[PDB]
Amino acid sequence: ELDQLRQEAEQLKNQIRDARKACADATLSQITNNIDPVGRIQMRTRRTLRGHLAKIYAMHWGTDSRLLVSASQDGKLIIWDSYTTNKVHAIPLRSSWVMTCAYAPSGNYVACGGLDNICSIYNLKTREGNVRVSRELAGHTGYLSCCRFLDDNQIVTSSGDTTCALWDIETGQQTTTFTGHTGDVMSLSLAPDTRLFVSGACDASAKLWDVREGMCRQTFTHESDINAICFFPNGNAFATGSDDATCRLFDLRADQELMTYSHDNIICGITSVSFSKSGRLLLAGYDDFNCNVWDALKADRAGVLAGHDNRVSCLGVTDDGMAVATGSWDSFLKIWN
Amino acid sequence: QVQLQESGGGLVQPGGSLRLSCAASGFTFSNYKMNWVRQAPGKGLEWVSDISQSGASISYTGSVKGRFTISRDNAKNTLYLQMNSLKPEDTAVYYCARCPAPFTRDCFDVTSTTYAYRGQGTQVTVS
Amino acid sequence: SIAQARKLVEQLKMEANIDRIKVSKAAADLMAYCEAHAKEDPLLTPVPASENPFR
Amino acid sequence: VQLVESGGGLVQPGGSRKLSCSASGFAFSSFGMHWVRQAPEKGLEWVAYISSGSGTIYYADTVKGRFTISRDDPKNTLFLQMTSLRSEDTAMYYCVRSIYYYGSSPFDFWGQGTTLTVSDIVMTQATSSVPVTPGESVSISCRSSKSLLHSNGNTYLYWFLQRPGQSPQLLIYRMSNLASGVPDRFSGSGSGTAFTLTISRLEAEDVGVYYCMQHLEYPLTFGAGTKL
Amino acid sequence: TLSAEDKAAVERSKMIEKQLQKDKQVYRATHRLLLLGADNSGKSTIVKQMRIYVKTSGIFETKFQVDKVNFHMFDVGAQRDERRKWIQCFNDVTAIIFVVDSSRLQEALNDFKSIWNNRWLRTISVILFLNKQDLLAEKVLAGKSKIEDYFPEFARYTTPEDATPEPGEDPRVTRAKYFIRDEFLRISTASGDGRHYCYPHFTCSVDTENARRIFNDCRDIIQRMHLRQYELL
Amino acid sequence: CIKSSYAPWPRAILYGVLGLGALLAVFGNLLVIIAILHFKQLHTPTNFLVASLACADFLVGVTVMPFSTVRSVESCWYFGESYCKFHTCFDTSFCFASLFHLCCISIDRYIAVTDPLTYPTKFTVSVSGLCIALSWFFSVTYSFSIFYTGANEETCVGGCQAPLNQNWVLLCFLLFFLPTVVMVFLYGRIFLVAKYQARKIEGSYKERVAKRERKAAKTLGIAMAAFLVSWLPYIIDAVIDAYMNFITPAYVYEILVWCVYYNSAMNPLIYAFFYPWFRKAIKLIVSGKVFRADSSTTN
Ligand SMILES: CN(C)C1CCCCC1
Questions:
Q1: What is the DSSP string of D53-101?
Q2: Ligand 1 in contact with F260 (CB < 6 A)?
Q3: Which biological process, per GO, is one annotated for this protein (chain A)?
């Protein structure tokens, strides 16, 4: 019956755990006992981007590290100019319950989505002087949580249903569908190699997928739901944040946890996680109106980016690595340097 | 990997007594609120009782009030349930569940076979 | 419900025999990569005020 | 997109005339508009400019107090009133559109134009005519009175080509970027005072006149031009 | 100290700012409401009777204007049972219209307790509707099903003096109604700071006075907020 | 004329009691305008009205308040005869400019409570423009038509205290009577609404209802008493002196007259400093911190 299947699954899990323990021979904390400390790092606000009405939920930097896009619950996507604090585009949306946005790697398209279970693709450079809807992807049954671009004709989506999807813009169908989760998948990050990508769901489990194969390859298992995930700049490790006030750093080749970032004075959860250009600083936003910077080699706090009023929702770092963009539920955007 | 193992199931005569034990691992047992859930045949899941972090606050379903008792052991990381004077309608599958977010006062744990932080379940029958 | 159990067993079997390296070998490579780009990180070492777009 | 001009004709000196450019196929409310006049055989000139929202006005020095410009957004029309017409206003007029933001391409479309008959920074590109056979590369040089580079990093140099028989079109803007419908065969370069435009492979439809433009200052000067 | 195009870009940015400012008066003059409920409750009946004035969409929107003020009503119809992550979007909603079917009650009590004690859902008021009051009278009159079987504390209850029934039908129906009403208000009572209150009502799926019932509650909420702001309460 | 001399003796401790009010009326009122103008929040029309009132109050704290101090103690007016034609015009204008403002603040607070749903649309920014400009206009026309033109006339070179005449003493009475009764009626209705909303919550036990009533009374009656006790004696003396002899001595004209001025000191301490958000925004100014960046008052 099902009893033999359960016994076989338990035996397989025990064997995998034993093998993973056998492959562990040292702790990175012991090794990292000679590197000089990063030292106290001070950061100051440079610009303040005002103009939104309701709370801001997501943002994404551009490829040229000059333009950025922001999404609000008032039903607005605003494209800013970081250097001079201007306003280029003020796209109004149909449904005012958006939860994600994405900026194309070439600068020609923008994407949005939310509770409507529809991904909208907007075109920026057109013959006329207005932005119009180009495609309305609709094949999901839950709520969109994150969207990312691979090329100008490929997009990857994550939904409230325990599925992920790869789409084709020209046709409007689903080329590949990934399944295997149990809870809601809420974050999605892409590797620089463009071949692999990670996913994090509300089951205390992180997964790695293959775009061409369409099948899972790894599974990493945290105590509560996972809110954010991000790749290491090398491409062989990643970081995850949860609601238990901890941050974890996993390595793909070793397939085992490496470090834990937590402190006894931290009770609220983590919402956004990002790295730096050199992969030395880990910036994480928390629910207690503050944001912390960790040295991802010794698990020691260094500097706080205080200055917001309500919860911090979004956080990003430019490709050129010259600024950090932070948003919150106070309808404000801050640029730190 | 978090897991919840139940025990204490079986068959009993009407009017008897019974014990149920729930064991947990992989998380700090002293910072979460625990609940008990049962599933009758042909009916959806229902809430029975819950116990707070320190056991100061305790609540029961009206239909089972006065006969069931709930307790926890933080040192041993264990949850207990004591049942007395069973009735023929009190045969079902039992689960011990945990609130999703620590340091909170509310939970959404009665879900149609979708909740992840739930045990396998034990069948208890009386006749 | 047997189909779900069979799928889970097959998924666990597929991800059961894979190549794995020691933790120390991956940690050393991570440290080596991290120490090779220390001079190209403006956040680590602040850029002079002249070469700063946000002044 | 369509931009059609109404007006023109022959007028005695000292009269008054109305010229109207009407647009169709694009959002007129978000585009600034200029006016460019061309003498029968003498270069190009800038005479008037209106911005978006009707918040800013500019005129030329020779028409500072005789011409007036206005637009009607709901009717999607623009028009200018010309008074005290001398013998210098016998020319062909074009209504051109431009939009200004980061990454935009101003002067992206020109109209057919209408003819009318009556009964600062200086550029020298006096290379006259350089005839050439089809198949080989060419090069056109240009010099500016003052350096056009600014502290923002840009250069503000524009190139234009007019085929014989129709309106001009845009080729290169800001001295480095390439237009949309133009091929990759054209290329451009410069250093601040000396600039050049190069065609590596020439085709039989490349005959025409080549002009230039600066946009560092509101007084706008085109140049003499060059013929191939 | 700017070029020719920088000034035009600044002018365009100021025009966008003017448009945004003109797009603000329409936002604060409109009130939004979140309408929850179970499956057996008369949710669809209320939505259909509010109309007096696309196959997988996850949200539905309703517009209605009373007393020269217009409201926005939202209802979810395509999500999954788990709802602990998309409920955080509604933190700037004027009120939550809960609907309970009196004829399964303990599940509604648990849902109300969970919503009332949420961290991000504070400062949000709840308008409670106890629908299907016609069938309750018939059920209690029939007598085949006793309420004391599911609730033991029903015996030690008395009709309160402040209770005033409009029709002269029966006292037992009033006792049964006010038992449930007090059971619901007991959860709301155990709170502090007076940030959010409860507004129970006795309504049916066919009643035509629901629009004014919401209007009065919204007016009371706004008035209490304004009074508390100016140190008058 | 020089010979006239004040009876006070070298116990001149009064110089500060009336001087502290003068210092507070100028130093304590510029802070309000700075806080209102700097912070991006608190830009609502209700705060525009308070900012005007602060503007009207500031001009009397440095023009009339310190110059009239000498005249109210020594009674010599050594400053100049030419200023007399301007000082008098700057006293009847600037005060009456702080009286109609209270009537606008009241009506705004009333419309904010008795009709909550349609408040943002009715009380727009342009309405406060009429509210701000009308009081100044009426005060200006009344100031120079009666006093500057010298049409109210009916001694030696000293401190002129030109009183009103028979035909222009009621016009100084109706303009005080109408706004006072309007404000009293509006705040009475506000108190009735507050009393009504206090009993519905307590559902009534007469243990907390009295507490809510006491809080409402303490909030409203303080402002009513502050207004109505610093203005009534002067109007009473003006109506008594008119249609009668000048039995009133000079011993008290200065007391009264001085008394009235004081209220331009209590205005920023009653309509600005009593709410927490203004206090927080004002405290941030003293710390320095303003220089670093802006902030968000708790509101
Ligand atoms: C005497 N000063 C205080 C004022 C009093 C009110 C009328 C105008 C003059």
A1: GG--EEE-STTTTTEEEEEETTTTEEEEEEES--TT--EEEEEEEE--S
A2: yes
A3: cell population proliferation
